[PDB]
Design a protein around this nucleic acid. Structure first.
Ligand code: SF4
Ligand SMILES: [Mg+2]
Ligand SMILES: [Mg+2]
Ligand SMILES: [Mg+2]
Ligand SMILES: [Mg+2]
Ligand SMILES: [Mg+2]
Ligand SMILES: [Mg+2]
Ligand SMILES: [Mg+2]
Ligand SMILES: [Mg+2]
Ligand SMILES: [Mg+2]
Ligand SMILES: [Mg+2]
Ligand SMILES: [Mg+2]
Ligand SMILES: [Mg+2]
Ligand SMILES: [Mg+2]
Ligand SMILES: [Mg+2]
Ligand SMILES: [Mg+2]
Ligand SMILES: [Mg+2]
Ligand SMILES: [Mg+2]
Ligand SMILES: [Mg+2]
Ligand SMILES: [Mg+2]
Ligand SMILES: [Mg+2]
Ligand SMILES: [Mg+2]
Ligand SMILES: [Mg+2]
Ligand SMILES: [Mg+2]
Ligand SMILES: [Mg+2]
Ligand SMILES: [Mg+2]
Ligand SMILES: [Mg+2]
Ligand SMILES: [Mg+2]
Ligand SMILES: [Mg+2]
Ligand SMILES: [Mg+2]
Ligand SMILES: [Mg+2]
Ligand SMILES: [Mg+2]
Ligand SMILES: [Mg+2]
Ligand SMILES: [Mg+2]
Ligand SMILES: [Mg+2]
Ligand SMILES: [Mg+2]
Ligand SMILES: [Mg+2]
Ligand SMILES: [Mg+2]
Ligand SMILES: [Mg+2]
Ligand SMILES: [Mg+2]
Ligand SMILES: [Mg+2]
Ligand SMILES: [Mg+2]
Ligand SMILES: [Mg+2]
Ligand SMILES: [Mg+2]
Ligand SMILES: [Mg+2]
Ligand SMILES: [Mg+2]
Ligand SMILES: [Mg+2]
Ligand SMILES: [Mg+2]
Ligand SMILES: [Mg+2]
Ligand SMILES: [Mg+2]
Ligand SMILES: [Mg+2]
Ligand SMILES: [Mg+2]
Ligand SMILES: [Mg+2]
Ligand SMILES: [Mg+2]
Ligand SMILES: [Mg+2]
Ligand SMILES: [Mg+2]
Ligand SMILES: [Mg+2]
Ligand SMILES: [Mg+2]
Ligand SMILES: [Mg+2]
Ligand SMILES: [Mg+2]
Ligand SMILES: [Mg+2]
Ligand SMILES: [Mg+2]
Ligand SMILES: [Mg+2]
Ligand SMILES: [Mg+2]
Ligand SMILES: [Mg+2]
Ligand SMILES: [Mg+2]
Ligand SMILES: [Mg+2]
Ligand SMILES: [Mg+2]
Ligand SMILES: [Mg+2]
Ligand SMILES: [Mg+2]
Ligand SMILES: [Mg+2]
Ligand SMILES: [Mg+2]
Ligand SMILES: [Mg+2]
Ligand SMILES: [Mg+2]
Ligand SMILES: [Mg+2]
Ligand SMILES: [Mg+2]
Ligand SMILES: [Mg+2]
Ligand SMILES: [Mg+2]
Ligand SMILES: [Mg+2]
Ligand SMILES: [Mg+2]
Ligand SMILES: [Mg+2]
Ligand SMILES: [Mg+2]
Ligand SMILES: [Mg+2]
Ligand SMILES: [Mg+2]
Ligand SMILES: [Mg+2]
Ligand SMILES: [Mg+2]
Ligand SMILES: [Mg+2]
Ligand SMILES: [Mg+2]
Ligand SMILES: [Mg+2]
Ligand SMILES: [Mg+2]
Ligand SMILES: [Mg+2]
Ligand SMILES: [Mg+2]
Ligand SMILES: [Mg+2]
Ligand SMILES: [Mg+2]
Ligand SMILES: [Mg+2]
Ligand SMILES: [Mg+2]
Ligand SMILES: [Mg+2]
Ligand SMILES: [Mg+2]
Ligand SMILES: [Mg+2]
Ligand SMILES: [Mg+2]
Ligand SMILES: [Mg+2]
Ligand SMILES: [Mg+2]
Ligand SMILES: [Mg+2]
Lengths: 82, 57, 276, 96, 208
RNA sequence: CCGAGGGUAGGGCCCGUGACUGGGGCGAAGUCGUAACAAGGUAGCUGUACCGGAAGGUGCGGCUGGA
RNA sequence: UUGGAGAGUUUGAUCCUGGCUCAGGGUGAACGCUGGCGGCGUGCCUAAGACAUGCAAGUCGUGCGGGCCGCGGGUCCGUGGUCAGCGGCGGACGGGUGAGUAACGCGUGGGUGACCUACCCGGAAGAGGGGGACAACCCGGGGAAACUCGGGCUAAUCCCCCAUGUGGACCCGCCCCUUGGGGUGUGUCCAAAGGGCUUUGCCCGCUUCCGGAUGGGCCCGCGUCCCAUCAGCUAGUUGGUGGGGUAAUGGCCCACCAAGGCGACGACGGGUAGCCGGUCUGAGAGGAUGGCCGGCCACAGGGGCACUGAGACACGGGCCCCACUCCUCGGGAGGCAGCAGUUAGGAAUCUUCCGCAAUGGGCGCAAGCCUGACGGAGCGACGCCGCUUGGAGGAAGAAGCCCUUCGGGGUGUAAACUCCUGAACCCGGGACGAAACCCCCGACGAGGGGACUGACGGUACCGGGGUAAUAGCGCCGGCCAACUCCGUGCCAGCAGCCGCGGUAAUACGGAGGGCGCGAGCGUUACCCGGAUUCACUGGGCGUAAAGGGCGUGUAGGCGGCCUGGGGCGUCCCAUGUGAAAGACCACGGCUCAACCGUGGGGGAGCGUGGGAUACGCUCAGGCUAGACGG
């Protein structure tokens, strides 16, 4: 089923994922449906996380599944806040 | 076979590189000195890299 | 070249055993080298790149001396051979230390019959030869125990070197052995290198026919010194006298070179051959 | 030298079996109904074409047939029995 | 690494004092003021007309040799200036000048660029509060270039700051001594800097 | 029924190799003549034909890049 | 308008034509000499040859029944392990390779009224009744093994029947639509399954149907290499009616009927090649290329085939033939183009390493299990970037060595020598990457609170102490930057092209000196460049290579003056598409840089809509200067 996932970019000891919407069956760093944010887990910049929170709400709405630590980033930037 | 004096003979195992010799029509290759059963030139000093010769003392 | 000792084995009578290491003085089968052949020397990556005496010994057997005749072209003979000391490394061009001539060693009567011939009919070489093949050696028959004194304290200017060695006969072929049995420092640590420079040099000429003395063991066990007088050139010549005198002492004689000879004859003349 | 891939095989055989069997009966009855329409034999053809109708869709419940194929299989059985009976009517009972 | 050799010969070849040695450059023990001819067996031999190529070649080695910079890193900088906007000559010198080991020079913390190199390498400098030991560091306009205070109590820095009390530093620079810091105010204009190099020639050397 | 492929038989293309034979290129100092370049000592070239150790010559016609 | 250098070589000399050669940039490179540190990349181009050994795909006791080991005692039962079995989902993804393929294969843009899509998400309705089978297990043959054979018991979310029919399916008729799209009526046909806990209530499942999302199938236009010394090809061949098959169109397959279909706009054949994003070069136009990374394709020893299934005609599933190899007489066994590794071939190409900590994937309520994907580490100057081998002072200038007109010149501030800094090493501390899942509060939601876990790694980095501490390679006639002595005497040798060497060689060999690069420098091989030397940009043909021996004419190319219709080309605006990465510009993160992130700028090309009408096209009408006729 279609998914919201971290698609690793960057370099060695330089993670910079690309929180992304994609078919479960892909390669991790493979063609995705749409990009809807990023993540620099090492917080090396003022903004180590952005999310088109509009879209994550769309994708979620039609069955997209967040990963166990993709909700974490979706939560923290309040996609679920009522 | 480039250099002054060699050690090649029948059954010498050898490595060839491109490059003709203008004077010997029909010759179109050179033996890489210093590889396989091709020795470097004894007592060579200048351009030793091109002749298979290692650095002296 | 670098190589990758992957696994390490021990062959038993009925199976192979994989070990995790192989201590020195032991031996076994390493799996993983690709470009290594027999006689090659292997050392650790971070380790002094020595070459163990693996693969060795020739030896040249016929001694023919070539006098450079006349005289301002001696350098082309010494350069002809630098073309021949690489095309054919079986032979040796060596200057006799005393009498001072260049002597073309070799591998038989015929080997110098081609080199001294090609030398002339291709390079001209203003030079001529005799010459024999008088290429014997020298060794002792019994263990000798002597001294090696060299003292000149008649003016203050240096010259004291004391050496006492045990020179025994070695089994024929083993070459030359040298052990340093100095107990304490009755001779200094720095005088040990160049006291072998007097022994090894005094073996190059002999006591009966003046030919290289081979196949003996030399145990240096004693010797005294003077602090002021002892120079390194006074410990070299004390080992030379001692050895030229030691070799001379306990029964030395002439070891001649033997040939393994394969004569390929028609059978009609076999007896003419054999008897002769 | 292993697996539950072999379990899959042991399993796929019983499935295949159970599938082949339904499929047989389908064809047999379908053919049989059509034959009985060709001479029609009106009452009986439909009676039979019904058992076929029934076995076709029942097959399409499992992994046997695709819903579209059973739909396909069904269309053709009907248009055959009917266009057949065409040569001499009396089409009672029911399946029209 | 760097040229790391005899340097007086460099200058004699160039036929022009490059100031590469520090204090002796101004002394009359300098080699150029003793022998203003090129090094080796043939220097006092009457020169023959240089080729257009020779000229560009020499003019470039000049600029190169001044900054003590690898032909690799040089070329790299030069290429970047060609890609960069507007004038190449200026931007090249500019980019040449923005080198940390060179900023440290015109701020006279050291006498020769070689000396400044080691100064940068050994930890003794600091850009903007943090320590920076990379002689290539591109100093950008607006930064703070100090001796790191953990080695301000040091004989050689003292002696060179001592000699830098009231000398005007180029217009693009500001040196507060005692505090031993500095600031890269702006990047140099062309006319703003003299060096015995016709810039246009280096450009033409790479256009061959 | 079709069906991997096996077999039988006959063809097409390609590659390598072959007694011997054809001419081709190259190769510091071979043998014979001297066809061409000066009207080159018979102007030259030419398509063709026949001839002749060889270059070549001769017929017929053509060209001037000849007189 | 950020972009464009040429040189040597035909002659006695000239100008021209013309080939040859060089300098530049590039590479999955390799070979010589040489080699200190680190980072990110990257590393079988050949035999899609053959492979030893280990690992690369499983998971659910919250679907079911079981045998053995325990833990409370009354041979009992509960329980949780555990091993297979039945059942379910996965195993069609992920990972490898480029052999085949000149094709709807790929690229780009469209069509599907001709179609599928498990899990995930929305909306509707349902879960009632009965029956049944096979493994495990108990019994019995054969084997040196693979293992299998037969007789009987049994559970379920396994299998079947009956019923319900929200609904869906098929035939026939009608209504709208227009290729098989939505609707309606009568006939007929079709659903289901339980488990759990804290148990009058939620949780995970099941059933039919409708929509969404995602992923696909098939079709069509246009683009995609060399040979015409391959010129004609075609019998399922082209079309049609009927039928089979499929999720679905179709000659996809069959039967018949028709006699078609394709081709100089290059069919057929032969050769070569996976294609693309991109990569390299280039002023551009162009050329060359497809390794790494992303997308599609194809293939899984050579072949054929189907089964299961939402999906495969399935790399680590099945069957059969072949080749090869293997274990000990019936047979069996194997499939590294997964990860490492061996062997062969080759100029050449890596560790049988570490970890699931993270990211992603599979199953699972969850704890969790698995993951050679992946995250790391190792080796290789393969590549790129960074850094070191010291800094300042130090003589009209030591020694040695080179040159000399014998005065002197050169190496050269170079060294020594003084002082200063302090790569290495040594101690001390020591990470970011890791906050979720889970637990508690709330309501198992929103929100808050708490805990656990790091392969790399005692590494980066930070603190303190701290030693002067690798340099090599090419080249010095001209092109082309760098000159003298000796040796040698058409020898020995150099050589990229012109050419050097025949006794005074800046061209060979050494030396001293010099120039150029520098942990590299050179060589060979290949690509683009210079080559306006295939010329679209941007060339030529009297004598340099080049006008067909000359007509006539087919196709094709091109085409006078005026007016109007259409708008095909051409032009213009809008809109969709032109993935990501890359390249570019700006900003930032690793001490810099390489490398890496964020943001921007977009264009060619096609789809659609809208517009213009000069020129080109077409249609109509008119002319007489071209052309033809009297
Ligand atoms: S002294 Fe300074 S300036 Fe004079 S030559 Fe030597 S380095 Fe150049
Ligand atoms: Mg040999
Ligand atoms: Mg060999
Ligand atoms: Mg040379
Ligand atoms: Mg039957
Ligand atoms: Mg099926
Ligand atoms: Mg079905
Ligand atoms: Mg300190
Ligand atoms: Mg350029
Ligand atoms: Mg057949
Ligand atoms: Mg056949
Ligand atoms: Mg067969
Ligand atoms: Mg004549
Ligand atoms: Mg004539
Ligand atoms: Mg004549
Ligand atoms: Mg004439
Ligand atoms: Mg004639
Ligand atoms: Mg005759
Ligand atoms: Mg005649
Ligand atoms: Mg005539
Ligand atoms: Mg004339
Ligand atoms: Mg020219
Ligand atoms: Mg010439
Ligand atoms: Mg000429
Ligand atoms: Mg000439
Ligand atoms: Mg030319
Ligand atoms: Mg390969
Ligand atoms: Mg390649
Ligand atoms: Mg195996
Ligand atoms: Mg089990
Ligand atoms: Mg499956
Ligand atoms: Mg391929
Ligand atoms: Mg083809
Ligand atoms: Mg096509
Ligand atoms: Mg298409
Ligand atoms: Mg039962
Ligand atoms: Mg029913
Ligand atoms: Mg037919
Ligand atoms: Mg049909
Ligand atoms: Mg049909
Ligand atoms: Mg067909
Ligand atoms: Mg017919
Ligand atoms: Mg082929
Ligand atoms: Mg291929
Ligand atoms: Mg051009
Ligand atoms: Mg790829
Ligand atoms: Mg195949
Ligand atoms: Mg196969
Ligand atoms: Mg294979
Ligand atoms: Mg097979
Ligand atoms: Mg399934
Ligand atoms: Mg397949
Ligand atoms: Mg599989
Ligand atoms: Mg298979
Ligand atoms: Mg496999
Ligand atoms: Mg492998
Ligand atoms: Mg080999
Ligand atoms: Mg690797
Ligand atoms: Mg390997
Ligand atoms: Mg994991
Ligand atoms: Mg995980
Ligand atoms: Mg592992
Ligand atoms: Mg590391
Ligand atoms: Mg490195
Ligand atoms: Mg190397
Ligand atoms: Mg002087
Ligand atoms: Mg001197
Ligand atoms: Mg002097
Ligand atoms: Mg110095
Ligand atoms: Mg942490
Ligand atoms: Mg609660
Ligand atoms: Mg430590
Ligand atoms: Mg420190
Ligand atoms: Mg100190
Ligand atoms: Mg020093
Ligand atoms: Mg060079
Ligand atoms: Mg050059
Ligand atoms: Mg020059
Ligand atoms: Mg002289
Ligand atoms: Mg000679
Ligand atoms: Mg001469
Ligand atoms: Mg000379
Ligand atoms: Mg020379
Ligand atoms: Mg030269
Ligand atoms: Mg470097
Ligand atoms: Mg070229
Ligand atoms: Mg150029
Ligand atoms: Mg250029
Ligand atoms: Mg071109
Ligand atoms: Mg050409
Ligand atoms: Mg043109
Ligand atoms: Mg031309
Ligand atoms: Mg002509
Ligand atoms: Mg002509
Ligand atoms: Mg004509
Ligand atoms: Mg026409
Ligand atoms: Mg017109
Ligand atoms: Mg026309
Ligand atoms: Mg239009
Ligand atoms: Mg893009
Ligand atoms: Mg920065
Ligand atoms: Mg971007
Ligand atoms: Mg008209």
């Amino acid at each position: 089923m279609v998914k919201i996932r971290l698609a690793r970019f960057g370099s060695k000891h330089n993670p910079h994922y690309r929180i992304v919407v994609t078919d479960a069956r892909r390669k991790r760093d493979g063609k995705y449906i749409e990009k809807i944010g990023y993540y620099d887990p090492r917080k090396t910049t003022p903004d180590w996380l952005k999310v088109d929170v509009e879209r994550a709400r769309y994708w979620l709405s039609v069955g997209a599944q967040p990963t166990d630590t993709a909700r974490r980033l979706l939560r923290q930037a309040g996609v679920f806040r009522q | 076979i480039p250099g002054e004096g060699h050690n090649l003979q029948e059954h010498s195992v050898v490595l060839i590189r491109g490059g003709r010799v203008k004077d010997l029509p029909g010759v179109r290759y050179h033996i890489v000195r210093g590889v396989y059963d091709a020795a470097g030139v004894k007592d060579r000093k200048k351009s030793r890299s091109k002749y298979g010769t290692k650095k002296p003392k | 070249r670098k190589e990758r000792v992957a696994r390490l084995l021990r062959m038993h009578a009925n199976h192979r055993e994989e070990v995790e290491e192989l201590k020195a003085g032991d031996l076994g089968a390493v799996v993983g080298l690709k470009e290594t052949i027999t006689g090659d020397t292997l050392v650790g990556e971070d380790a002094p790149r020595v070459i163990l005496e693996s693969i060795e010994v020739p030896e040249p057997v016929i001694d023919v001396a070539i006098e450079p005749k006349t005289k301002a072209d001696q350098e082309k003979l010494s350069q002809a051979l630098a073309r021949l000391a690489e095309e054919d490394p079986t032979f040796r061009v060596s200057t006799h230390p005393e009498t001072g001539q260049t002597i073309i060693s070799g591998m038989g009567e015929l080997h110098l019959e081609i080199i001294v011939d090609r030398l002339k009919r291709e390079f001209k070489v203003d030079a001529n030869v005799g010459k024999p093949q008088v290429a014997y050696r020298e060794t002792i028959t019994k263990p000798v125990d002597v001294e090696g004194k060299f003292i000149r304290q008649t003016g203050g200017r240096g010259q004291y070197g004391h050496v006492k060695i045990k020179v025994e006969p070695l089994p024929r072929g083993s070459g030359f052995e040298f052990v340093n049995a100095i107990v304490g420092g009755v001779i200094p640590k720095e005088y040990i290198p160049a006291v072998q420079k007097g022994i090894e040099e005094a073996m190059q000429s002999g006591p009966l026919i003046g030919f290289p003395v081979v196949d003996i063991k030399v145990t240096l066990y004693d010797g005294s010194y003077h602090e002021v007088d002892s120079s390194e050139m006074a410990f070299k010549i004390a080992g030379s006298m001692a050895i030229k005198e030691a070799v001379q002492k306990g029964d030395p004689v002439i070891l001649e070179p033997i040939m393994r000879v394969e004569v390929t004859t028609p059978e009609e003349y076999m007896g003419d051959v054999i008897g002769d | 030298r292993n697996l539950s891939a072999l379990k899959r095989h042991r399993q796929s055989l019983k499935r295949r079996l159970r599938n082949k069997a339904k499929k047989s009966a389908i064809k047999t009855l379908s053919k049989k109904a059509i034959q009985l329409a060709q001479e029609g034999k009106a009452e009986e053809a439909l009676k039979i074409m019904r058992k076929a109708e029934s076995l076709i869709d029942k097959a399409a419940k499992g992994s046997t047939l695709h819903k579209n194929a059973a739909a396909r299989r069904k269309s053709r059985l009907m248009r055959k029995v009917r266009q057949l009976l065409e040569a001499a009517g009396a089409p009672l009972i029911g399946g029209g | 690494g760097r040229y790391i050799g005899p340097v007086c010969r460099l200058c004699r070849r160039e036929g022009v004092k490059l100031y590469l040695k520090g204090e002796r450059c101004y002394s009359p023990k300098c080699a150029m003021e003793r022998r203003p001819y090129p090094p080796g067996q043939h220097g006092q031999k009457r020169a023959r007309r240089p080729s257009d190529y020779a000229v560009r070649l020499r003019e470039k080695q000049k600029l190169r040799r001044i900054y003590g910079i690898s032909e690799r890193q040089f070329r790299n900088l030069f290429e970047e200036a060609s890609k960069k906007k507007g004038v190449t000559g200026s931007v090249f010198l500019g980019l040449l000048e923005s080198r940390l080991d060179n900023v440290v020079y015109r701020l006279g913390f050291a006498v020769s660029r070689r000396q400044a190199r080691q100064l940068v390498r050994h930890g003794h400098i600091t850009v903007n509060g943090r320590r920076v030991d990379l002689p290539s560091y591109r100093v950008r306009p607006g930064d703070e270039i100090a001796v790191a205070e953990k080695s301000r109590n040091l004989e050689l820095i003292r002696q060179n700051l001592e000699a830098m009390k009231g000398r005007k530093v180029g217009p693009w620079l500001s040196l507060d001594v005692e505090g031993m810091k500095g600031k890269f105010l702006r990047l140099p204009d062309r006319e703003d800097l003299a060096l015995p190099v016709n810039e246009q020639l280096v450009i033409e050397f790479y256009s061959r």
